[PDB]
Design a protein around this ligand. Structure first.
Ligand code: NA
Ligand code: NA
Length: 316
DNA sequence: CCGACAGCGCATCAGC
DNA sequence: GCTGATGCGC
DNA sequence: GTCGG
């Protein structure tokens, strides 16, 4: 952390500025990508030229690293920090439901703080009110032990609605992470292939696990949950996926991002194409065939003739 | 030089 | 009322 | 902002 933490912190702060104030999502991802590859770099960087050797780091970031190494700061960043508007816009986006556009709208009309948000509840939609209500809780990490307890409840209540349901908690949790930011549940049922979600949601509300709803329709639910005691309120999403697309979904939403990118790359070489939903064979001219039958996660690995990777070892 | 960079489900906004 | 765009989370 | 056609 102390190795290149100053550089990675700088790039992260620049990333947030680009996403929230400039609304340039690709510059945000560019800075994040650079911060990530530097955070994995097992050496204390001595120059921008050294860092430019890394993929994701180009001329501009190399220049910024040079300034940071020689002065301990970035003139552009310091000005951004001392900017009332930019800092207020940046902060407001920390409220769930408030993105760059809403934050801009709020700051433009004098709304800059949480207190300003509370005084103006009428200007906030339902999601933003919930985000405001659980501002502190939503910025807390979820320790794995709590994730296990939360998993216990979800699997139990899901089985109670119908024992033919299949539920899988994915995300970094499934990869064995010590902590998570939210709970991502993937749900399926043999009767559904290509009102099942409501029944499960309703039951989780019935036992007071789900406390609030952010967005709810046929296939994807977003809401708020809480362990019984007081535990912090947590963000939870539940996805209803067709049975024949389930394990492709489980694979996709388990990750990691870098892992999926590599598995798709290997699949391409073997003559298969993998997305979120299906794995399809490719023709001699590049045409994708019909979706292949998938009944387990290992089936996908079998098509690619790849050794099955345990979720624990899917960080890359 | 210049386009890609993930994009889908859902809520809300803009226009008819 | 509707359709399509925009915003947001992940 | 960086990469690559
Ligand atoms: Na580079
Ligand atoms: Na936000």
């Amino acid at each position: 952390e102390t190795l290149n933490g100053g550089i990675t912190d700088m790039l992260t702060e620049l990333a947030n500025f680009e996403k929230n104030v400039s609304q340039a999502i690709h510059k945000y991802n560019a800075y994040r990508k650079a911060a990530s590859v530097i955070a994995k770099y097992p050496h204390k960087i001595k120059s921008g030229a050294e860092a430019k050797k890394l993929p994701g780091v180009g001329t501009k970031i190399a220049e910024k690293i040079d300034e940071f190494l020689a002065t301990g700061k970035l003139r552009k960043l310091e000005k951004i920090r001392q900017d009332d508007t930019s800092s207020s816009i940046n902060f407001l986006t920390r409220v769930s439901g408030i993105g760059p556009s809403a934050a801009r709208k709020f700051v433009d009309e004098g709304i800059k703080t949480l207190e300003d948000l509370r005084k103006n509840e009428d200007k906030l939609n339902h999601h933003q009110r919930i985000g405001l209500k659980y501002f502190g809780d939503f910025e807390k990490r979820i320790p794995r032990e709590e994730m296990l307890q939360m998993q216990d409840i979800v699997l139990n209540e899901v089985k109670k609605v119908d024992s033919e349901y299949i539920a899988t908690v994915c995300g970094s949790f499934r990869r064995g992470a010590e902590s998570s930011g939210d709970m991502d549940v993937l749900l399926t049922h043999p009767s559904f292939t290509s009102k099942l979600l409501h029944q499960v949601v309703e039951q989780l509300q019935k036992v007071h696990f789900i406390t609030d709803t952010l967005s709810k329709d046929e296939t994807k639910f977003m809401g708020v949950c809480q362990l019984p005691s007081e535990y912090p309120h947590r963000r939870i999403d539940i996805r209803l996926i067709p049975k024949d697309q389930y394990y492709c979904g489980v694979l996709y939403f388990t990750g990691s991002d870098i892992f999926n990118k590599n598995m798709r790359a290997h699949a391409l070489e073997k003559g298969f194409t993998i997305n979120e939903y299906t794995i399809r064979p490719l023709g001699v001219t590049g045409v994708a065939g019909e979706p292949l039958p998938v009944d387990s996660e290992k089936d996908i690995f079998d098509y690619i003739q790849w050794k099955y990777r345990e979720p624990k070892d899917r960080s890359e």
